[PDB]
Coordinates of all heavy atoms in Angstrom, one line a residue:
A1 N -16.6 -1.5 -22.1 CA -15.5 -2.2 -21.3 C -15.3 -1.4 -19.9 O -15.5 -2.0 -18.9 CB -14.2 -2.3 -22.0
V2 N -15.4 -0.1 -20.1 CA -15.3 0.9 -19.1 C -16.5 0.8 -18.2 O -16.2 0.7 -17.0 CB -15.3 2.4 -19.8 CG1 -16.5 2.7 -20.8 CG2 -15.2 3.5 -18.8
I3 N -17.8 0.9 -18.7 CA -19.0 0.5 -18.0 C -18.9 -0.6 -17.1 O -19.1 -0.4 -15.9 CB -20.1 0.5 -19.0 CG1 -20.1 1.8 -19.8 CG2 -21.4 0.3 -18.1 CD1 -20.1 3.2 -19.0
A4 N -18.8 -1.9 -17.7 CA -18.8 -3.1 -16.9 C -17.6 -3.2 -15.8 O -17.8 -3.7 -14.7 CB -18.5 -4.3 -17.9
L5 N -16.5 -2.5 -16.0 CA -15.4 -2.2 -15.1 C -15.9 -1.3 -13.9 O -15.3 -1.4 -12.8 CB -14.2 -1.4 -15.8 CG -12.9 -2.3 -16.0 CD1 -13.1 -3.7 -16.5 CD2 -11.8 -1.6 -16.7
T6 N -16.8 -0.4 -14.1 CA -17.5 0.3 -13.1 C -18.2 -0.6 -12.1 O -18.5 -0.2 -11.0 CB -18.4 1.4 -13.4 OG1 -19.7 1.1 -13.9 CG2 -17.7 2.3 -14.5
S7 N -18.4 -1.9 -12.5 CA -19.2 -2.9 -11.7 C -18.3 -3.9 -11.2 O -18.4 -5.1 -11.4 CB -20.3 -3.5 -12.5 OG -21.0 -2.4 -13.1
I8 N -17.2 -3.4 -10.4 CA -16.2 -4.3 -10.1 C -15.8 -3.8 -8.7 O -14.7 -3.3 -8.5 CB -14.9 -4.3 -10.9 CG1 -15.1 -4.5 -12.4 CG2 -13.8 -5.4 -10.4 CD1 -15.5 -5.9 -12.8
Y9 N -16.9 -3.7 -7.8 CA -17.1 -3.5 -6.3 C -15.9 -2.7 -5.8 O -15.1 -3.3 -5.0 CB -17.4 -4.8 -5.6 CG -17.8 -4.8 -4.2 CD1 -19.1 -4.2 -4.0 CD2 -17.3 -5.5 -3.1 CE1 -19.7 -4.2 -2.8 CE2 -17.9 -5.6 -1.9 CZ -19.2 -5.0 -1.7 OH -19.8 -5.0 -0.4
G10 N -15.7 -1.4 -6.1 CA -14.6 -0.5 -5.7 C -13.9 0.0 -6.8 O -13.1 0.9 -6.7
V11 N -14.3 -0.4 -8.0 CA -13.9 0.4 -9.3 C -15.1 1.1 -9.7 O -16.2 0.6 -9.5 CB -13.3 -0.5 -10.3 CG1 -12.7 0.3 -11.5 CG2 -12.1 -1.4 -9.6
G12 N -14.9 2.4 -10.2 CA -16.0 3.1 -10.7 C -15.5 3.9 -11.8 O -14.5 3.6 -12.4
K13 N -16.2 5.1 -12.0 CA -16.4 5.9 -13.3 C -15.0 6.1 -13.9 O -14.7 5.6 -15.0 CB -16.9 7.3 -13.2 CG -18.4 7.3 -12.5 CD -19.4 6.6 -13.4 CE -20.8 6.7 -12.7 NZ -21.3 8.1 -12.6
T14 N -14.2 6.9 -13.2 CA -12.8 7.2 -13.5 C -11.9 6.0 -13.6 O -11.3 5.7 -14.6 CB -12.1 8.2 -12.6 OG1 -12.9 9.3 -12.2 CG2 -10.9 8.8 -13.4
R15 N -12.0 5.2 -12.5 CA -11.1 4.1 -12.1 C -11.0 3.0 -13.1 O -10.0 2.3 -13.2 CB -11.3 3.7 -10.6 CG -10.2 2.9 -10.0 CD -9.0 3.9 -9.6 NE -7.9 2.8 -9.4 CZ -6.9 2.6 -10.3 NH1 -6.8 3.4 -11.4 NH2 -6.1 1.6 -10.2
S16 N -12.1 2.9 -13.8 CA -12.4 2.1 -15.0 C -11.5 2.5 -16.2 O -10.4 1.9 -16.4 CB -13.8 2.3 -15.5 OG -14.7 1.6 -14.5
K17 N -11.8 3.6 -16.9 CA -11.0 4.2 -17.9 C -9.5 4.4 -17.5 O -8.7 4.5 -18.3 CB -11.6 5.5 -18.5 CG -11.7 6.7 -17.5 CD -12.0 8.0 -18.2 CE -13.4 8.0 -18.7 NZ -13.7 8.7 -20.1
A18 N -9.2 4.5 -16.2 CA -7.9 4.5 -15.8 C -7.1 3.2 -16.0 O -6.0 3.1 -16.3 CB -7.8 4.9 -14.3
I19 N -7.8 2.0 -15.7 CA -7.3 0.7 -16.0 C -7.1 0.6 -17.6 O -6.1 0.2 -18.0 CB -8.2 -0.4 -15.5 CG1 -8.2 -0.4 -14.0 CG2 -7.6 -1.8 -16.0 CD1 -9.0 -1.5 -13.3
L20 N -8.2 1.0 -18.3 CA -8.0 0.9 -19.8 C -6.9 1.6 -20.4 O -6.4 1.2 -21.4 CB -9.4 1.2 -20.5 CG -10.6 0.5 -19.9 CD1 -11.9 0.8 -20.8 CD2 -10.4 -1.1 -19.8
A21 N -6.6 2.9 -19.9 CA -5.6 3.8 -20.3 C -4.2 3.0 -20.1 O -3.5 2.9 -21.0 CB -5.4 5.2 -19.6
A22 N -4.1 2.5 -18.8 CA -3.0 1.7 -18.4 C -2.7 0.5 -19.3 O -1.6 0.4 -19.7 CB -3.1 1.1 -17.0
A23 N -3.7 -0.2 -19.6 CA -3.5 -1.5 -20.3 C -3.5 -1.3 -21.7 O -3.6 -2.3 -22.4 CB -4.7 -2.3 -19.9
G24 N -3.5 0.0 -22.2 CA -3.4 0.5 -23.5 C -4.5 0.0 -24.4 O -4.2 -0.4 -25.6
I25 N -5.8 0.0 -24.0 CA -6.8 -0.6 -24.7 C -8.1 0.2 -24.7 O -8.2 1.2 -23.9 CB -7.2 -2.0 -24.1 CG1 -7.4 -2.0 -22.6 CG2 -6.3 -3.1 -24.6 CD1 -7.9 -3.3 -22.1
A26 N -9.0 0.0 -25.6 CA -10.1 0.8 -26.0 C -11.3 0.5 -25.1 O -11.2 -0.4 -24.2 CB -10.5 0.5 -27.5
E27 N -12.4 1.2 -25.3 CA -13.7 1.0 -24.6 C -14.7 1.0 -25.6 O -15.9 0.7 -25.3 CB -13.9 2.2 -23.5 CG -13.9 3.6 -24.1 CD -15.3 3.9 -24.7 OE1 -16.3 3.7 -23.9 OE2 -15.4 4.3 -25.9
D28 N -14.4 1.3 -26.9 CA -15.3 1.1 -28.0 C -15.7 -0.3 -28.1 O -16.9 -0.7 -28.1 CB -14.6 1.6 -29.4 CG -15.6 1.5 -30.6 OD1 -16.5 2.3 -30.6 OD2 -15.2 0.9 -31.6
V29 N -14.7 -1.2 -28.1 CA -14.8 -2.7 -27.8 C -15.5 -2.8 -26.4 O -15.3 -2.0 -25.5 CB -13.6 -3.5 -28.0 CG1 -13.3 -3.6 -29.5 CG2 -12.5 -2.8 -27.1

């Protein structure tokens, strides 16, 4: 989820898992 979020033209490595942390949701999914 984190990966594919890195492919969101200005979101990358950190910025991904930072949205996930926010939205209270996993990356295992």
Side-chain angles (χ1 to χ4, degrees):
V2 56
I3 312 304
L5 250 42
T6 80
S7 308
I8 305 293
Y9 191 67
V11 188
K13 298 297 182 61
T14 323
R15 202 76 196 104
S16 290
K17 66 169 74 217
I19 295 182
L20 312 181
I25 46 178
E27 61 81 56
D28 182 70
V29 288

